[PDB]
Structures are given as C-alpha cells and as structure tokens.
Amino acid sequence: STTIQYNSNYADYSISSYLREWANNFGDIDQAPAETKDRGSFSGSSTLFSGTQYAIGSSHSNPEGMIAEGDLKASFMPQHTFHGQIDTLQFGKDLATNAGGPSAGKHLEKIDITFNELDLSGEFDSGKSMTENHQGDMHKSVRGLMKGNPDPMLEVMKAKGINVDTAFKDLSIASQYPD
Numbered sequence: 671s672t673t674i675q676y677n678s679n680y681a682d683y684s685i686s687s688y689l690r691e692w693a694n695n696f697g698d699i700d701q702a703p704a705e706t707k708d709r710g711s712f713s714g715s716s717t718l719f720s721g722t723q724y725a726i727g728s729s730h731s732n733p734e735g736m737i738a739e740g741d742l743k744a745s746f747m748p749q750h751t752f753h754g755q756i757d758t759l760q761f762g763k764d765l766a767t768n769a770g771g772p773s774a775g776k777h778l779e780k781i782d783i784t785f786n787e788l789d790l791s792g793e794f795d796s797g798k799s800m801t802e803n804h805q806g807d808m809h810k811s812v813r814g815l816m817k818g819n820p821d822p823m824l825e826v827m828k829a830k831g832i833n834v835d836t837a838f839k840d841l842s843i844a845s846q847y848p849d
C-alpha cells in the first residue's frame with residue numbers, strides 16, 4: 671500500500687539512484703567527528719529514546735537530512751536497537767527545528783522524497799542477543815542510512831515488491847509534488 675511523493679527535480683532519479691546520492695553526501699556517522707555528530711532526536715515523547723518522530727541531519731556538515739514518523743523506539747545501551755514501525759519516511763535537506771525547541775519535532779526545509787504507508791517494522795527482545803536484534807528491517811535499514819549506506823534499505827524495499835530501479839517519472843506508486 672506504499673506510495674511515494676517526489677520533487678519534480680528528481681524525476682529522472684530512481685529510489686536507488688537518489689538514496690545513493692543522499693547517503694554519500696550524508697556520510698557515515700561513525701567516521702564523522704564528535705564535533706559535528708548528530709545522533710538524531712526523538713519527539714512526541716516524554717522520552718529521550720522514543721517518539722512519533724525521529725529526525726537526523728548529516729554529521730559531515732552537509733545539508734542532507736532524514737525524518738522518520740510512526741511508532742519509534744531506541745533501546746540504548748548496550749545493544750542500541752532501533753525498533754517499532756515507520757509509517758512515513760522522508761528525505762531532503764536543511765533540517766530545521768519546529769517552534770518550541772526540539773520538543774515540537776523538526777522539519778525539512780527542502781523535501782525531495784517521501785515514502786508513505788511504508789510499513790517498516792522491527793521488534794526488540796531484551797532476552798535475545800544484539801546480532802539478532804539488529805536483523806530487524808527497521809534497525810538494519812535506518813542504521814545503514816545513518817552510516818551512509820543505502821543498500822540495506824534498498825533490499826528491504828525490494829522485498830516489499832517496490833521497484834527501486836525505475837525512475838520516479840514512470841514509477842507507478844510515485845506521484846510528483848505540485849510546485
């Protein structure tokens with residue numbers, strides 16, 4: 671039931687084509703300095719590590735950013751597993767905080783791509799090991815993007831039957847943002 675909305679500027683792009691460009695400019699978060707490192711923030715919480723929205727900016731002083739929305743949970747130390755369900759995934763640039771500090775959540779100033787009703791799930795089990803907790807679709811695909819790697823997300827999407835090779839122009843589940 672997933673659909674996609676794209677800026678008219680990325681009509682010649684595909685899901686893979688775009689995400690590879692976004693990730694390479696977002697960069698691997700671990701290779702970044704602690705100086706400029708952004709580990710993302712949760713909002714709609716009462717919580718430091720859960721909320722309805724998760725937004726994170728590039729850790730290499732680049733404009734790229736990402737916003738996930740749904741039922742999101744972070745397990746923190748020692749496993750640090752991102753689990754729950756992502757309904758809406760959005761990519762763009764210039765992450766900006768909403769009026770009311772981080773607590774009001776953040777927004778992207780330039781929206782490129784938006785996945786809707788993606789149904790990106792993942793469970794966490796405290797009794798189980800880290801390795802197996804990291805196999806969840808949600809964690810391994812989002813963590814991959816955080817490490818500037820679009821590949822895990824791309825095979826999760828392909829497993830969902832979503833075409834990641836066709837340009838947004840001719841992709842049936844994708845429509846263009848009115849400019």
Ligand code: HEM
Binds near residue numbers: 712718750751
């Ligand atoms: C407000 C949000 C978050 C904060 C403040 C936070 C904090 C931290 C801290 C302090 C570390 C240890 C330092 C380091 O390894 O660089 C860490 C590591 C890590 N983080 Fe996060 N985290 C957050 C959310 C997330 C999310 C959403 C993911 C994945 C999608 C994630 C995945 C990881 C992983 C895989 C490690 C490896 C360290 C280990 O497993 O021992 N974290 N995080």
